[PDB]
């Protein structure tokens, strides 16, 4: 009887033969296996279904931007964002190197491109043998390390052969055998492209893919290993249906010119031809203004690197062309001339979502877990091979719930900020505008106050009746303001006597804006933030029309909001150095973004002051001085786009939320790494 034919066996302890000190781990990849493919055609795919059922599965695995092969596989194996690991796209150009990058190129094997540290390098650096069978970067001198077995990419190698050869290396002697393996298949991505994501072709592709996984599983059976190998079935990204009738051509807006090179598809980027002579010279900003709001329903949108949604993490690398285009589902873009299956879109689109299944002794049997970014996988792979992971973008421990016996028991980040209290100091002035505690504190910060990770920043906690403000004495402005807005609730300001009187405090004196809205003290100087007029339309609608609407839906919401200063667009909090170097002229420090974390309970009957389980959403909102970005409906539509993980917020603000929460550290991490999927 074949492996597919049997019922679900439990694997409480690894049942390995002698010569196996521990389970070996296989990272099988099937290119462009849209997460959806399983949601529908599971009944046609018995093998993957059994893997789903006797294993740890997730309905959606969120890939990285851009949703292409090379950036995603290399993200999988480094736990890094493309912006940090180097491989930005299958086709890219580095102006510092003056070099191009093609898969069909000599540069394809150049070690300068691939940054970070893949799992096999990590395994090698720690005396663990590793055998790949095709994997982006595996045949490349990364840190001078190759895998202990590898294959240079020859795409025409039969699939059934790749399955056999991996099954052979498991037969290898205990001294030269790998402990970590990778497979790769081009399907269903080939058929995905050639015939589109919905076609009898992809069904065929899927059923081959299915049967070949069945083979490996039968081979592992016929090696005494079906209860010994830890399998991870995975994919890079999903697959979207192609257009012709939904393709943007920039010749219409520019004339059919040949002076700018423009990367095609949904991941569209633009740079000058005269490169690297005119790369940093080029005024991109004006070309963007020349291209925003140019149609009734403009299905594309220009975006200078830093002003893209930060949740994408696509700006730090110099390989990223300073002018990108965000696109709407299904739509692509070129410079000049379409009906093919494609990918590369927003990582939050439904069809970009990827497959993840974990089978074997380490993983749970028949557990559906929530959705996660693929950058988390690296840390899970380090755990499974007893490796200390390289520094990476995964929140290490957030996947502990996949594992029967998890290794890493994580703990919250320790507070590094300096937290002295603010008594009544600046007695006593006016601005001339035309005008017990523990019970109050607990109410403002029901989940615990944010913890200042900012080493070693001087912060004051300021108690008010309706809200708790976290004021920065190193920046003389608030960092955060938390209030609980329960389900049922104009040119004047007051001096806060606990904060130093900076001249920016009077009405006489880009404007001010309130962190906690007054329509519920909120007119304290310690509650105002520097804010543009074109942002005030977003802000005053958010707290009036939008936020009050949510309070009813959720039965109360708890809000934390504040400034974000990310001038160098990495998506982390800026050093005080570059804070000085970006304070425009009074010598105001001026926020690039405003964050807002909305916290409800999953149980609607509970109010935020009394949640069992948490419900979270967060927003990194961009503080642009005009609403060119967005041209009732438009303000919400901006919020949904500029969503962020709570972790994204923590990274960018140096704050840490929910440390005082019933939930374990691992549960909170999973909560804080949540993003919701569009369509
Ligand atoms: C995703 O995770 C990665 C991995 O940790 C992380 O990227 C890393 O960020 C740090 C800081 O930006 C990088 O370290 C830098 O290295 C270069 C030289 O190679 C230096 O120029 C930098 O020096 C500054 O920082 C020093 C101390 O921190 C200061 O003393 C000094 O004055 C400089 O200001 C800095 O040391 C590191 O190389 C990267 N690694 C990679 C692989 O990119 C990234 O932040 C994470 N992404 C997100 C969105 O959180
Ligand atoms: C490390 O050397 C290579 C490893 C590869 N591993 C996986 N897939 C590869 N391909 C390149 C991407 C191709 C898919 C196209 P898409 O980017 O998913 O649109 C399929 C073949 C590799 C291509 C490679 O070199 C060309
Ligand atoms: C950069 O490389 C290109 C292509 O190899 C070449 O044409 C050019 O001379 C180089 N230019 C500079 C300015 O280094
Ligand atoms: C790729 O592998 C196949 C099967 O072994 C072989 O027939 C073919 O010649 C190989 N191509 C190259 C370029 O090595
Ligand atoms: Ca920064
Ligand atoms: Cl679930
Ligand atoms: Zn791919
Ligand atoms: Zn593809």
Angle, helices 159-169/200-221, rounded to nearest 10 degrees: 20
Q: Is the domain of 313 the same as that of 421?
A: no
| Residue whose CA lies nearest to ligand 2 atom number 24 | 153
Q: What is the best residue among 95, 96, 97, 98 to mutate for testing ligand 3's pocket, by most ligand atoms within 8 Å of CB? A: 98
Rounded Cα distance between 145 and 126, Å, is 12
Q: Is the domain of 561 the same as that of 502?
A: yes
Q: Is the domain of 48 the same as that of 177?
A: yes
| Residue whose CA lies nearest to ligand 1 atom number 24 | 575
Rounded Cα distance between 351 and 37, Å, is 9
Rounded Cα distance between 254 and 250, Å, is 6
Q: Do the beta carbons of residue 362 and residue 405 sit within 8 Å? A: yes
**Closest ligand to Cα 310:** 1
Q: Which of 383, 408, 433 is the last residue of a domain?
A: 408
CATH assignment at residue 14:
3.40.720.10
Rounded Cα distance between 131 and 435, Å, is 74
Q: Is 313 in the pocket of ligand 1 (CB under 6 A)?
A: yes
Rounded Cα distance between 641 and 605, Å, is 29
Burial bucket for residue 458 (CB in 10 Å: 0-12, 13-18, 19+): middle
The residues carrying an active-site annotation are: 69
Q: Is 157 in the pocket of ligand 4 (CB under 6 A)?
A: yes
**Closest ligand to Cα 79:** 1
The number of CA neighbours under 13 Å toward the Cβ of 74 is 28
Q: If DSSP codes are grouped into helix, strand and coil, which group holds residue 581?
A: coil
Q: Is the domain of 394 the same as that of 513?
A: no
Q: Is the domain of 429 the same as that of 353?
A: no
Q: If DSSP codes are grouped into helix, strand and coil, which group holds residue 513?
A: strand
> Which ligand 1 atom minimizes the distance to the CA of 84?
43
Residues 6+ apart with CB under 8 A from 414: none
Q: Is 32 in the pocket of ligand 2 (CB under 6 A)?
A: yes
Q: How far is the CA of 19 from the centre of ligand 8 (A)?
A: 39
**Closest ligand to Cα 153:** 2
Cα 512 to Cα 427, 482, 506, 520, 600, distances in angstroms: 23, 19, 10, 19, 28
Q: How far is the CA of 84 from the centre of ligand 1 (A)?
A: 9
Backbone angles phi, psi at 639, to 5 degrees: -65, -50
> Which ligand 2 atom minimizes the distance to the CA of 152?
2
Rounded Cα distance between 352 and 67, Å, is 7
Q: What is the best residue among 64, 142, 566, 572 to mutate for testing ligand 1's pocket, by most ligand atoms within 8 Å of CB? A: 572
> Which ligand 4 atom minimizes the distance to the CA of 154?
1
Pairing mode, strands 323-327 and 269-272: antiparallel
Note the Cα 588 to chain centre separation in Å. Answer: 31
Q: Point out which residues pair with 109 in neighbouring strands.
A: none
Q: Is the domain of 123 the same as that of 203?
A: yes
Q: Do the beta carbons of residue 543 and residue 288 sit within 8 Å? A: no
Q: Is the domain of 462 the same as that of 521?
A: yes
Q: Is the domain of 100 the same as that of 188?
A: yes
The number of CA neighbours under 13 Å toward the Cβ of 422 is 23
- Domain tally for the chain? 2
Q: Is the domain of 353 the same as that of 479?
A: no
> Closest Cα partner for 384 from 231, 520, 497?
231
Q: Is the domain of 588 the same as that of 672?
A: yes
Burial bucket for residue 286 (CB in 10 Å: 0-12, 13-18, 19+): exposed
Q: What is the dihedral of CA 378, 382, 387, 389, to 10 degrees?
A: 30
Q: Which of 408, 435, 454 is the last residue of a domain?
A: 408
Cα 67 to Cα 6, 225, 240, 268, 581, distances in angstroms: 36, 34, 11, 12, 35
Q: How far is the CA of 155 from the centre of ligand 4 (A)?
A: 8
Cis peptide before 276 (omega within 30 of 0): yes
Q: What is the best residue among 134, 153, 157 to mutate for testing ligand 4's pocket, by most ligand atoms within 8 Å of CB? A: 157
Rounded Cα distance between 620 and 641, Å, is 10
Q: Is the domain of 400 the same as that of 422?
A: no
Q: Do the beta carbons of residue 242 and residue 343 sit within 8 Å? A: no
Q: Is 49 in the pocket of ligand 1 (CB under 6 A)?
A: no
Q: How far is the CA of 71 from the centre of ligand 1 (A)?
A: 19
Helix (H) or strand (E) holding 480: strand 477-485
Rounded Cα distance between 326 and 270, Å, is 12
> Which ligand 4 atom minimizes the distance to the CA of 155?
1
Per the entry, the structure determination technique was X-ray
Rounded to a whole number, what is the largest CA-CA distance in the chain? 87
Q: How far is the CA of 31 from the centre of ligand 7 (A)?
A: 5
Q: Point out which residues pair with 551 in neighbouring strands.
A: none
- How many residues can be counted in the chain? 679
> Which ligand 2 atom minimizes the distance to the CA of 155?
21
Q: How far is the CA of 202 from the centre of ligand 4 (A)?
A: 25
Q: Which of 388, 408, 428 is the last residue of a domain?
A: 408
Q: Is the domain of 380 the same as that of 456?
A: no
Q: How far is the CA of 149 from the centre of ligand 4 (A)?
A: 18
- Here the contacts of 621-624 (C-beta below 8 Å, separation 24 or greater) are 621/538, 621/593, 621/594, 621/595, 621/596, 622/307, 622/309, 622/592, 622/593, 623/531, 623/532, 623/535, 623/564, 623/590, 623/591, 623/592, 623/593, 623/594, 624/307, 624/532, 624/534, 624/535
Q: How far is the CA of 272 from the centre of ligand 3 (A)?
A: 14
Cβ atoms within 10 A of the Cβ of 164, count?
13
Which residues line ligand 3 at a C-beta cut-off of 6 Å? 98, 276-277
Q: Is 572 in the pocket of ligand 1 (CB under 6 A)?
A: yes
Rounded Cα distance between 63 and 31, Å, is 12
Question: Which range marks the domain in which residue 104 is found?
Answer: 1-408
CATH assignment at residue 452:
3.40.570.10
Cα 14 to Cα 18, 196, 230, 362, 524, distances in angstroms: 12, 41, 9, 8, 62
> Which ligand 3 atom minimizes the distance to the CA of 276?
13
């Amino acid at each position: 009887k074949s492996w597919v034919e049997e019922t679900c066996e439990s694997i409480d302890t690894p049942e390995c033969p002698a010569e196996f000190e521990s389970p070996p781990t296989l990272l099988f990849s099937l290119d462009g296996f849209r997460a959806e493919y399983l949601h529908t055609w599971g009944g046609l795919l018995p093998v993957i279904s059994k893997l789903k059922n006797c294993g740890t599965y997730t309905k959606n695995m969120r890939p990285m931007y851009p949703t292409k092969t090379f950036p995603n596989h290399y993200s999988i194996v480094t736990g890094l964002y493309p912006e940090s690991h180097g491989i930005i796209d299958n086709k890219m150009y580095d102006p510092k190197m003056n070099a191009s990058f093609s898969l069909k190129s000599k540069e394809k094997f150049n070690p300068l491109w691939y940054k970070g540290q893949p799992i096999w390098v990590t395994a090698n650096h720690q005396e663990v043998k590793s055998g790949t069978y095709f994997w982006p970067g595996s045949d490349v001198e990364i840190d001078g390390i190759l895998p202990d077995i590898y294959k240079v990419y020859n795409g025409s190698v039969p699939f059934e052969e790749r399955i056999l050869a991996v099954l052979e290396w498991l037969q290898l002697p205990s001294h030269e055998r790998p402990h970590f393996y990778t497979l790769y298949l081009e399907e269903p991505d080939s058929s995905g492209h050639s015939h589109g994501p919905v076609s009898s072709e992809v069904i065929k592709a899927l059923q081959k893919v299915d049967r070949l996984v069945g083979m490996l599983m039968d081979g592992l059976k016929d090696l005494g290993l079906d209860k010994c190998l830890n399998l991870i079935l995975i994919s890079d990204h999903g697959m979207e249906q192609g257009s012709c009738k939904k393709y943007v051509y920039l010749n219409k807006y520019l004339g059919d010119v040949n002076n700018v090179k423009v990367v095609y598809g949904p991941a569209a980027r633009l740079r000058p031809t005269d490169v690297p002579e005119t790369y940093y010279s080029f005024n991109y900003e004006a070309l963007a203004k020349n291209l925003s709001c140019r149609e009734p329903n403009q299905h594309f949108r220009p975006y200078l690197k830093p002003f893209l949604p930060k949740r994408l993490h696509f700006a730090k690398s110099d390989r990223i062309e300073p002018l990108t285009f965000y696109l709407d589902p299904q739509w692509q873009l070129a410079l000049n001339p379409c009906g093919s299956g494609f990918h590369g879109s927003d990582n939050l689109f439904s069809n970009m979502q990827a497959l993840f299944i974990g089978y074997g002794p380490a993983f749970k049997h028949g557990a559906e877990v929530d959705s996660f970014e693929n950058i988390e996988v690296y840390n899970l792979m380090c755990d499974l091979l007893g490796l200390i992971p390289a520094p990476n973008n995964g929140s290490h421990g957030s996947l502990n719930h996949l594992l029967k016996k998890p290794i890493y028991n994580p703990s919250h980040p320790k507070e590094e900020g300096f937290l002295s209290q603010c008594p009544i100091k600046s007695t006593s002035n006016d601005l001339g505008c035309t005008c017990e505690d523990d019970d109050i504190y607990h109410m403002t910060v029901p989940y615990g106050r944010p913890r200042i990770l900012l080493k070693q920043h001087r912060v004051c906690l300021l108690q008010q009746q309706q809200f708790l403000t976290g004021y920065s004495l190193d920046l003389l402005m608030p960092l955060w303001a938390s209030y609980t807005f329960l389900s049922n609730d104009s040119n004047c300001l007051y001096q806060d006597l606990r904060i130093p009187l900076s001249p920016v405090h009077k009405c006489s004196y880009l404007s001010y804006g309130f962190l906690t809205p007054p329509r519920l003290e909120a007119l304290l100087t310690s509650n105002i933030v520097p804010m543009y007029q074109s942002f005030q339309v977003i802000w005053h609608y958010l707290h009036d029309t939008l936020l009050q609407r949510y309070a009813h839906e959720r039965n109360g919401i708890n809000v934390v909001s504040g400034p974000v200063f990310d001038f160098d667009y990495d998506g982390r909090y800026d050093s005080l150095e570059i804070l000085k170097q970006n304070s425009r002229v009074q010598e105001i420090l001026i926020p690039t973004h405003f964050f807002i974390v909305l916290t409800s309970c999953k149980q609607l009957s509970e109010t935020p002051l009394e949640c069992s389980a948490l419900e979270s959403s967060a927003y990194i909102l961009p503080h642009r001085p005009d609403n060119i970005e967005s041209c009732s409906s438009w303000v919400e539509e901006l919020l949904t786009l500029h969503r962020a993980r709570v972790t994204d917020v923590e990274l960018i603000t140096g704050l840490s939320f929910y440390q005082d929460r019933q939930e374990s550290v691992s549960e909170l991490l999973r909560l804080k790494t949540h993003l919701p999927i569009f369509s």
